[PDB]
Amino acid sequence: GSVAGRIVIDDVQPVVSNGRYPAKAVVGEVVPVAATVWREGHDAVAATLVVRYHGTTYPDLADPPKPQRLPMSPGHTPDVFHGHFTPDRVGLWTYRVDGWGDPIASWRHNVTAKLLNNDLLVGARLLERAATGVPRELREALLEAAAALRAPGDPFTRAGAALSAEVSDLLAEYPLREFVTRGEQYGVWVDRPEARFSSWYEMFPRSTGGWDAEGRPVHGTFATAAEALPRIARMGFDVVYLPPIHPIGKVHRKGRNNSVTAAPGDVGSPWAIGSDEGGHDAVHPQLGTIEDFDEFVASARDLGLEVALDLALQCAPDHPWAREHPEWFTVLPDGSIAYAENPPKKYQDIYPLNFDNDPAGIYQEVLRVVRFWISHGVNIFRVDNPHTKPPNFWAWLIGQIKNENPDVLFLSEAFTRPARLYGLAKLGFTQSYTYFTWRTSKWELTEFGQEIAAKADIARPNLFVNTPDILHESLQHGGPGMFAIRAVLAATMGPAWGVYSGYELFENQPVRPGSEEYLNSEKYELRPRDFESALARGESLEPFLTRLNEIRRLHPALRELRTIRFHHVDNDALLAYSKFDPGTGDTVLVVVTLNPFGAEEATLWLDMPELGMEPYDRFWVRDEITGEEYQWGQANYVRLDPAKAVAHVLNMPLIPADKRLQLLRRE
Amino acid sequence: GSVAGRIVIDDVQPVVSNGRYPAKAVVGEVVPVAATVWREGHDAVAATLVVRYHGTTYPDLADPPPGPQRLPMSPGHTPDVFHGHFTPDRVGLWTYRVDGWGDPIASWRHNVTAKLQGESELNNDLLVGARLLERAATGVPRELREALLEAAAALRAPGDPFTRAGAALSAEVSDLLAEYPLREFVTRGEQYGVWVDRPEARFSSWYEMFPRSTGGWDAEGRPVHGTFATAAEALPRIARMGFDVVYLPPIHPIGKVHRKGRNNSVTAAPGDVGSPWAIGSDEGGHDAVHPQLGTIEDFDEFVASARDLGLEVALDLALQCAPDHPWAREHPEWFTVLPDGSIAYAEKYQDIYPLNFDNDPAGIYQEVLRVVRFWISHGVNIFRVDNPHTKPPNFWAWLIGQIKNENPDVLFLSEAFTRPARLYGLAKLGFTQSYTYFTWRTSKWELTEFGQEIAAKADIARPNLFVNTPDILHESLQHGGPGMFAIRAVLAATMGPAWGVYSGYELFENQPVRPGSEEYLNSEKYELRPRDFESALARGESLEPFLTRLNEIRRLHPALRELRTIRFHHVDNDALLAYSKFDPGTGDTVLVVVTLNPFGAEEATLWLDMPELGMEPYDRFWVRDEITGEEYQWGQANYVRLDPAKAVAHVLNMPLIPADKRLQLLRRE
Ligand SMILES: OC[C@H]1O[C@H](O[C@H]2[C@H](O)[C@@H](O)[C@@H](O)O[C@@H]2CO)[C@H](O)[C@@H](O)[C@@H]1O
Ligand SMILES: OC[C@H]1O[C@H](O[C@H]2[C@H](O)[C@@H](O)[C@@H](O)O[C@@H]2CO)[C@H](O)[C@@H](O)[C@@H]1O
Ligand SMILES: [Cl-]
Ligand SMILES: [Cl-]
Ligand code: NA
Ligand code: NA
Ligand code: NA
Ligand code: NA
Ligand code: NA
Ligand code: NA
Ligand code: NA
Ligand code: NA
Ligand code: NA
Ligand code: NA
Ligand code: NA
Ligand code: NA
Ligand code: NA
Ligand code: NA
Ligand code: NA
Ligand code: NA
Ligand code: NA
Ligand code: NA
Ligand code: NA
C-alpha cells in the first residue's frame, strides 16, 4: 500500500501486517521489492528504490505490561516496478519506493510513433534541462543532441542523436525526474547468515559418558561431551543443540519411558529444571562446573561449531524460584499449584510459570538468565513451546537481548496452529519449527515447500528430521531408505535443518504401537551410542549426512527459500523441485522417491523458463550423490532405486544474471 | 494489519492499501469484518467490534499541489479468525476497530462441563468459577449483580458439583455475562475507515440519451435539433422502463473551430452538429448550455421533470476544450503551448485541446471546482467523468474531497477503460462507480472470471455495467441478432448492481461504421439521431418490454443489489452460465441460468453448490422463474434447457437463506 500524490505508489512488498513488523533477511541475501507505480495518460513513469542502513537498533514489537538510490525495472505485469538490494551488514535496513514522471522517455515514444518540428524543439528544451542535472564531463552528449534537433532539415537526421542508445544510457544514470513522490518507508531486520543457513545436531551431554566394563551407562560430563564434538563437525553441522544443562528436580522426578515415579539412580528429564543445587543459571553437578561449560564452548568454537542452549521457562517443584517467588505461579484455592500441561501431553514433573501476577519481577529474572548464558558464549537459544507464554513477553525479551547483542538468535519450538506459529515468527523468532515431520505424501510435501517459499519474508524454517519427542510413523515403517529420504527432503527444502542424535543409527522403535515417542527415550535415561562401530560396520547414515552438508556448502541455491519451484513428474511416489541462487546463478534440481522399498520410474517434465532455458534446449547435469552425468532436455526419464540412491541432487546450468533477477520477481 | 499486546490482532479486513484509503459501503449494506485474534495456551480469546460514526467529513485522499457501538464478534470455523458485521444507517465516515481480550469465563465453562468427575476433583475449579463471577459482578450495575452473587455462593456450598455449578451455568447468568462480559487484557486494534454513500452509489439503473436527438423530425423527414423541453418529454418512457438515472453527454455550446462531421469526419459540412465533447464556443464554456437546447432556466425545468418522474440527472464532466472555448482564449496557462505558439490536439481527438494541470494548479483547480458546484446548484448530484486516467490522480482526490465535504450525496462515475492498476486506483482515490471490461467479456470463462473479480473488489470499486455506449458496439451484438441484445442485458442487470443502456440498444442497432470497428454507423456523437421508439414497440420490434421486466426483477430482489455474494455454479455446457447472489440483510436469493448462444437451444445438468444456498446436498426445494412464471422442484443436480426463441435465461427466485447461515455465507475467510 502506499501514497497518492502527483504519482501514485500502491501495493508495496515486502510489507508485513501493513508495516506493523519488519520483514526478515540475512547478510548477502538478495531482497526483491515490488511496487505498483502509475500516473495519468500515456506518459512515461519510473521509480527509484531508496535503501538505507539504520544500525543495530532493534525495535520493541509488542506493548509491554548514506542511502543507496537503486533503479527499478518495469515488469511484464503492467504498472508493476521491481527492484532489489543486498544488505551487507547485520541490523535494521529500510527501503522506500519513489515514483516520478520520466518526460524524456515520453518524448522518445511520441517521436518514434510520429516517425514534427514542434515535437523536435520540445525534445531540445528537455535535453537542455536534463543536462543541468548531469556532471560537466558528461553534458556534451545531451547538448549536441539538442543542437541537432534545433538545426533545420529532415526529422530523421535531427532526432538521430536524441534517439540514440548513448543518450538513453546517460539518462538511465542521470534522469530528468518530474513530480517526485516519496513512498512510505518499510523495515527489514537483517541477521547474520546462520539465521537462515545452518545445520543443527541435537545431543544430550549426559549421554556422552560411554559405558563401564559391565555395559552399564556412565553419566557424561562437559569434558566427555567436548570429545563427542569432532565427529559432529566432521559431518558438516555448525550448530550443536543441547537439551537443558541445569540441575534436575528431585521432587516428582520422572522415571524411564515417561514413568510418573523415578527409581533410585533414575536421571529424570533435563526439562524439569532446578533443585537445591541451583536453577536456570546453574550447571548440573554431574556435568561439571560453569568453568567446565566454558571449556566445552571453547572446544566447540575451535571446531567451527556454535552452541545452542534450550530455554525452558518452567520449574521443577524443588527449583529455588518455587520457594523464593510463589507469586510467579498460579496457586489454586486449596494452596496447591497444578502441574504443567500441553493437551494431550502431561508434565507431572514441572510447574508452569505465571507472567501476569508480577510481570516486572519475572521479566527481569528471565532477562538475567539469558544475559548470563550469553556472557558464557551462547548466541543461540532453542525456546520451548513459546505459544504457552504471553506473546508480548517474547517481543520484550527478544528486543532487550538484540539491542545488547544483535547476533543472538532464537528458534521457536511452537508446534501450534498457523496464526500462532507465524505470529511468533512475526514477533521476532529468528527460526521456527514446522509441520515437516507430518508431511509425507507428494501433495503434502508440495504444499509444504510452496508454503515455506510464500512465507519467506515472515519466517525461516528449521527442518528437523526427528526430535527427542518425534519419531514419525514413516521412519518407524520405512527402514534405512526412509531415513535417507527424509534427510534429502530436510537438507534441500530447508536452508536450516536438523538431526537428533541416533537418527544416523536408524533408531526406529516407538514406546508402543501408534506412538511418536522413542522406546527407552533419552529424555528419561542415559543413551550412550557407539557411532564409530556402526560406521566401521557400514550400518550408519553418518557418511550420507556428511555428503548432504557438503552439497549444501557447495550450492548457494540451497540457502534459498523463495526460489523453490516444483516440476511435473508423472508418478505419485516421485517428487521434483529446483532452487536457484539470485546472487551467483547456482541452480539445483532434486528428484526424490517417497517409496523406500521398490524402484520408481517416470518422465520428468521440466518448467524450462524457471531454469532460465528454452523448451528445446539440451543441457548437461551432474548428480552430486553418485557423480553420474546426464544430458537432459524438457522431458527426461527418471528412475530411482532406494537400494542404490533415494534421490538425484543435480548441479544444473547456471542461470544468467538478467534471467535470475527476473525469476526472483514477486508478481 | 493490527497490533501486538498481551493479545495479538492481525490481518484485519476490510483494509485498503494498508489503511491509506477508506473501504466503500452504502446505507443499509451489511459490512463484514474479519480479524485473526490469538493469545497463549488453551485459554479462550474473544473480540469486540467497536463502531463509530464521524459525520459527513470527507478526507483528502491525495497530496494536493503547493498552490461507540460495541458489537460481538463470532469465532469462525477457520481457527483463530473472528467475524463481525455492522450496517451503517446514514451517509458519511464510519470507522471500526477490533478489540481483543481473554475470556476466562468461557475457558472455565468449557473445563467444568468437560469434567462434569466428583466433588473432590472439581472443588478447585468450582471455587475458581466463584471468583470469576465476582470479578464479572464488579463490572455489572448494582441492581443486576444478585444472580452472579447467588451463583458464586452456590458454587462454594458443599454438595454434588452439578447442583453447585447449576446457577453458574444457567441462561440467566449467561445472558448477563453477554451484556457485561468479564474481559481481561483488552487490546485495542487500529481504527479503519468506511465511507458510506447513499444507496444509488451501488444500486442504480442508467439510461444514456442525447437531448439534441429528442426533437423528432420535420415534414421533410429531416431531424430537428431537440431542446431541454423535448428532452423532458422523452423522460416518461425512460422512467416506465425502470431506469432511475438519465445520463446526458455534454450539454454545453459546441466548438465551431475544427468541428467534426458525420461518421467522425475531420471536416464538418455546414449544418453539421459536431461532437458534444468538443466543449465551448463564443457562446460560452462549461457553465453554459448549448443555445439550441435552450437556456439554464429550461435546464432547471428538465431536472424538475426528471425528479417528478423518479429520475435523477447525471451530467458528463469532460475536462477539455474546443479551440474556441473561452478558456483557450483567456487562460493559455491551462494548456501546453508548443514552441511555435500552437496547442496540440488531445489523444485521436482533432476537435479538442487537453488541459494542462501543472502550469497553474491553483487557478485550474479552483475553476473546475466552480464549474462542478455550479451544476450541483442546478440539481445535478451525479457526474459521469470522461477518461479520468488522462488527468492527474491527485486532482481527482482533491476535487471529489472538496465536493463531498460540502455535498456528501454527490456521486462520480469513472469512465476509465484502462489497465487494472489505474482502473482500481481511481476507484480507491474516491470514484463512486467505475466502467469495466464487461463488453469485451463474452465467453463463459471470461464472464466467470469477470464476475468473480467484481465480487473480490467490492470493498474498493463498484462496477457500472453498460451493455453498450456511444463508443462501443461490440462484435457480439453486431453478429448475434436480437437474442444477443437480450443475453447481454440479463448479464449486465443481474451481475451489475449498477448497469446501463445507451439509447437505440432497445431497437437492436447493430451496424458498425466499417467491418472490424466497434463504432456505430452514423454515430449519434456526430449527427442527430431521433428514433421512433413507440412505432417499433407497436410493431413488436423493441427490447423496451424486456428491459422493463429486468428493472422490475431488480427492484423485487435485494440480492441483485449485492456484489460480494456472487457464486458461480457448475453447468455442463460451454454455452450456458449459472450464478447466484443473496442479500445478507433479508435472505433474498436469486439464481441466473443464461445461454451465451442466441441461435440455438442449449441444455445441461446444473450442479448446485448447496451449502452456498444455505442447504444440504440431499435437500429438495421449489424455485420460481421470474421470466416465464414457471415453478420447478429442484435438488443438487437439475436438468436445464434454454431456447433463445422463447427465453434466453431463467432468473430464479430461490428459497430464503435463514439469518444465521446468511451472515456465515458473508464471511471473508
Ligand atoms: O520435564 C518436563 C517434560 O520434559 C519433556 O517435555 C519437553 C519436550 O521434550 C521439549 O521438546 C520441550 O519443548 O517442552 C517439553 C516440556 O518441557 C518430556 O517429554 C516430558 O515428559 C516432561 O514432563
Ligand atoms: O469531441 C471530442 C471527441 O468526443 C468523442 O470522444 C469522447 C467519448 O465519446 C467519450 O466517451 C469520452 O469519454 O471521451 C472522448 C473524448 O472526450 C468522439 O468519440 C471523438 O471522435 C471526439 O474527437
Ligand atoms: Cl522481537
Ligand atoms: Cl434518445
Ligand atoms: Na509507499
Ligand atoms: Na532471495
Ligand atoms: Na505491486
Ligand atoms: Na503513464
Ligand atoms: Na505505470
Ligand atoms: Na544464507
Ligand atoms: Na506478558
Ligand atoms: Na535447502
Ligand atoms: Na488492528
Ligand atoms: Na484474518
Ligand atoms: Na472461591
Ligand atoms: Na486576458
Ligand atoms: Na460517448
Ligand atoms: Na438472435
Ligand atoms: Na460510435
Ligand atoms: Na446507432
Ligand atoms: Na448504427
Ligand atoms: Na427519439
Ligand atoms: Na457491496
Residue numbers in the entry:
A (entry chain B): -1 to 63, 87 to 136, 145 to 696
B (entry chain A): -1 to 65, 88 to 136, 140 to 370, 375 to 696
Give the article text.
GlgE is a maltosyl transferase that transfers maltose from a maltose-1-phosphate (maltose-1P) donor to α-(1–4) glucan chains. GlgE is proposed to catalyse the transfer of maltosyl units to α-glucan chains through a double-displacement reaction in which an aspartate residue acts as a nucleophile forming an β-maltosyl-enzyme intermediate, while a glutamate residue is thought to protonate the phosphate and deprotonate the acceptor, acting like an acid/base catalytic residue16. Each of the protomers of M. thermoresistibile GlgE contains 5 domains and 2 inserts that have been described extensively in the first reported GlgE structure and therefore we will focus on the particular characteristics of M. thermoresistibile GlgE.
However, we could only obtain high-resolution crystals (~2.0 Å) when GlgE was co-crystalized with maltose, maltohexaose or both. The maltohexaose and maltose co-crystallizations produced indistinguishable structures in which only maltose could be observed at the active site. The structure of M. thermoresistible GlgE was solved by molecular replacement at 1.96 Å and refined with a final R-factor of 0.175 and Rfree of 0.203. From the maltose-bound structure, which is the highest resolution structure reported in this work, we can see that the donor substrate forms hydrogen bonds with the side chains of the highly conserved K283, N287 and S298 of the insert 1. K283 forms hydrogen bonds with the C3 and C4 hydroxyl groups and N287 with C2 hydroxyl group, all from the non-reducing glucose. The donor substrate further interacts with the side chains of the absolutely conserved Q343 and D378 of domain B, R411, D413, E442 and D498 of domain A and K552 and Y553 of insert 2. Two phosphate groups can also be seen bound to each of the chains sitting in a groove between domain N and the terminal α-helix of C. Two other phosphate groups sit in a positively charged patch formed by domains A and N of the two opposing protomers, near the active site. Interestingly all the phosphate groups are close to threonines, T98 for the first duo and T445 for the second. This threonine is highly conserved in all mycobacteria species and even in closely related organisms.
